[PDB]
Nucleic acid binder design. Structure first.
Ligand SMILES: [Mg+2]
Ligand SMILES: [Mg+2]
Ligand SMILES: [Mg+2]
Ligand SMILES: [Mg+2]
Ligand SMILES: [Mg+2]
Ligand SMILES: [Mg+2]
Ligand SMILES: [Mg+2]
Ligand SMILES: [Mg+2]
Ligand SMILES: [Mg+2]
Ligand SMILES: [Mg+2]
Ligand SMILES: [Mg+2]
Ligand SMILES: [Mg+2]
Ligand SMILES: [Mg+2]
Ligand SMILES: [Mg+2]
Ligand SMILES: [Mg+2]
Ligand SMILES: [Mg+2]
Length: 87
RNA sequence: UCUACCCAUGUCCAGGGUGAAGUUCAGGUAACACUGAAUGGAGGCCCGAACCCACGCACGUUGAAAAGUGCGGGGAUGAGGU
RNA sequence: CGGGACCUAAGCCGAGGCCGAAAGGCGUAGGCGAUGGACAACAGGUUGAUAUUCCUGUACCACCUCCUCACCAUUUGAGCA
RNA sequence: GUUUCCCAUAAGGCUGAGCUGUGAUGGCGAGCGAGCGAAGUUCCUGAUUCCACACUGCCAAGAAAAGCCUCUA
RNA sequence: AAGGAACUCGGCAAAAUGACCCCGUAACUUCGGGAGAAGGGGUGCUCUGUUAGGGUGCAAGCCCGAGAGAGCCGCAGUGAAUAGGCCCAGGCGACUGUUUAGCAAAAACACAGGUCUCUGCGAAGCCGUAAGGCGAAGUAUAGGGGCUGACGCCUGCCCGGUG
RNA sequence: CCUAAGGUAGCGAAAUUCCUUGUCGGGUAAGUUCCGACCCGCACGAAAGGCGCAACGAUCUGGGCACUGUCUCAACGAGAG
RNA sequence: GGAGGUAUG
RNA sequence: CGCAUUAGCUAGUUGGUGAGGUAACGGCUCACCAAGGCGACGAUGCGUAGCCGACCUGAGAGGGUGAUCGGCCACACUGGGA
RNA sequence: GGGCGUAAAGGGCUCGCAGGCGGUUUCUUAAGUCUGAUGUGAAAGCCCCCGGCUCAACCGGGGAGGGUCAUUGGAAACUGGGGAACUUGAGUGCAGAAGAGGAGAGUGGAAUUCCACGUGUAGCGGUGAAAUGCGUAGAGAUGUGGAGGAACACCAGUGGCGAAGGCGACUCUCUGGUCUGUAACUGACGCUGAGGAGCGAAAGCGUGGGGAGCGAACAGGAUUAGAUACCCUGGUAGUCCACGCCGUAAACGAUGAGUGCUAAGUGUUAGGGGGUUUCCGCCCCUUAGUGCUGCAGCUAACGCAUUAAGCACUCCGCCUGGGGAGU
RNA sequence: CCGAAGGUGGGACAGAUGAUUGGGGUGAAGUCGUAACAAGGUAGCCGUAUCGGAAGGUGCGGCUGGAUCACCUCCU
């Protein structure tokens, strides 16, 4: 994940000017990493070590989504639409 | 001009059943896998006429016939019949 | 209509040619050779005996010009091929 | 035949079973009696025939030559 | 009739089963099968009824058409004809196929698969005296020959003799 | 002691076992056949393959059910001689 | 001065 | 109470409408509708057992027993029926 | 009211659904929790106190006692539910650091073997001693070049990285994680985790490649009473590669994961800050790993000891004498 | 209509028995070797594969729960 792409994501999803810690922001960064990493694994199918990194990312994302849904259901629903998640 | 194989070019195989691969959809997953439906229409596939074959029995045995007839039988999209 | 004055497959024959005691065997060009390709007519009527064949009606194909009309062109000149 | 550019998702074409008109002021026609002669439509069903090896799929990878069209010599 | 394989080398022959619909279906398996396993049930006609629904058509009207309920008749309703008998277990061959035209259809041949071996291309091999051919308009992932015969697990020892 | 080396796995009274209807178990009232074991393999054996094996078979073999003129045991009727 | 590694009865 | 070397079970099953039936509510039964109900907080299945007051044991928590006496339940050769 | 370093006992390792457990302040609620009253827990029996059988057993009278019980009030510290805050846990941003972490594609040098050639001659090889074996058909030794496969000397270090298995030539592509500082942001979002999913040395298996060295099996020479072994000369599978399967190890630290607390000394790895400075460096401090020694404490002992086997709390796994049997 | 028993059929479950067969346990003195315990005389053990009368041998990988002697670090 390049730095300019990351700046796009954080600005697009941040809840306010200085916000970088919000669930929304974190889930956006993770979602790109997860998608980006999936593409790498499609070619390097046997890279089991890297894949373990993906599994932690997937767990982190689920926990942030679970937190958001329980905190404020509205915010949660908006985010999964913008990101196109099935959750 | 029988018959064996081959070569070239034709032609024949009523009907019914089963439902391969592939594909689509739905569910499912982080993704895949996986699951269920539908579509699809494979096969020296199944059942069964024509056609080809000839397993059993009876009869015929100076025969209707120098190899047949009757009742059943086997294959019947194939290495098929002609 | 089916076959020949059309085409070719398998195969057969084969000018020269190659090979072989002889007889002959093989084979190039070129031919032959349907079971295939190409190809213009249908309905009705009729005899004791034939019928897309004869008769009635209406067609179609190829070719020919004593003729008629239309158009084009006569040496980069139509047209045929 | 091949290559590069330009248009277009339409144009055009090549085909095509059949259907309608005409052929037909004709023929045929139950039947009547060589001759005479009515109605002669629609609906349903429907091919193993045709469009057509068209489409789809498959592997075992599915004649030739002439007719025919064209190109110059 | 009664019996029901007591017949016989042997259930030979005959009998029995047979169509459609519904329920249901084992061991085992190469997961496809076995399987129509097996074992049962229903079936006629009449009225609800040009039915629920479907095809065709502008509509009438034509066809197709389950399922039920309610009745009626007979010994019996695929009322006739045509239409698998089934199950258990073992031997052999895996299989479809082929074979002694006219006494043998099989366990025999073939087979996909396995392996060995020859063959560098004018290939080896084969036909012919030769030319000329097949191989092959192919080229070692190809072609010829020997043996084995799907698939699964395997395929031991001996090179003295013969090749 | 001999040989080149002395048969392994698996299977075995077998399409192979003469003795033999081997012995044992099952199936029958009674089973020289059949099935399951055993192993003294007359004379199995690993590509003239060994041992298994679903599916297949007008194959060979044994047992059940249905069914019956096959039979006990024959009778009647039809047609053709 | 101590740890770790490099034949019968 | 035991067993997961028992994980899915259920189809009057789970609700609704109506009717019937009962001393009486109720799928208790039927007809017609919908697809629901139970289950890892152990359904289902298998095995085992009458339950309890109490009795034996133990410092107690517990463990074992459920004879005699009392309460409740179930049964009367086996199955069903009124 | 027990344990799991060595006595039986920590899953090979990670990810993770359900479940269990959960930081600080305040308000609220009253499910858990505590409490008042009321109701109920038959008789016999057990216990306490009386009385009658000549005593005792036994019999009788009066009480006591007994529940995660129900109805109805109250309290609000803790647990649970709801709301609002907080930042330490956890994570994000921003700035740095190291690393055999992984996958893919290339490249390089040494050495073994083989092939060709020059020089060159009688042994070479091997053992405890020999022989089998190779060599006059020119071996071994030696020089040049070439082919091919596998592994990466020195660096290299109780050094690094990874969850574990494991990872060590160089270059490039893709890619995971950890550590340090910062306080810019979210504000408990966390821990563990049966079942489940993924990974998991070596051997082994299937298909197809590749095959130098090594080498189960096997052959031969020795050794030996025998030698189906050790030793020697050969040598097949395998070791290697792609895909798939297998899912086991003394998979070990024989030590589950998370968190916090509890003397020091001393190496070493990657950072940060500072102290005299151009620096170098020395010294000081600080994190996070990795070793040794060693208090308190623990242990049957051996030993562990801020990397606990100490003191605690949460969750998971597992043990209950040895064989039979991991059948 | 409902309906016990009974009948037919194919499965499920549980037990008993069975030719024959496989290891296992236990036994006063059997036979063959000697695998382990010391460096057990080839260190042992673990997983796996293969081989062998038998313990066992060998290969690949792993462990120290390995003896003896050399060398590099750590600690006293
Ligand atoms: Mg067929
Ligand atoms: Mg047939
Ligand atoms: Mg004929
Ligand atoms: Mg012709
Ligand atoms: Mg008899
Ligand atoms: Mg008799
Ligand atoms: Mg018969
Ligand atoms: Mg056969
Ligand atoms: Mg056949
Ligand atoms: Mg014959
Ligand atoms: Mg015959
Ligand atoms: Mg044969
Ligand atoms: Mg052999
Ligand atoms: Mg033989
Ligand atoms: Mg042989
Ligand atoms: Mg054979």
């Amino acid at each position: 994940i390049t730095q300019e792409r990351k700046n796009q994501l954080i600005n697009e999803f941040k809840t306010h000017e200085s916000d970088t810690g919000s669930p929304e922001v974190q889930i956006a960064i993770l979602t790109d990493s997860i998608n980006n990493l999936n593409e790498h694994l499609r070619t390097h199918k046997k890279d089991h070590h890297s894949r373990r990194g993906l599994l932690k990312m997937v767990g982190k994302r689920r926990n942030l989504l679970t937190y958001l849904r329980n905190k404020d259901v509205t915010r949660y629903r908006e985010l999964i639409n913008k990101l196109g998640l099935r959750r």
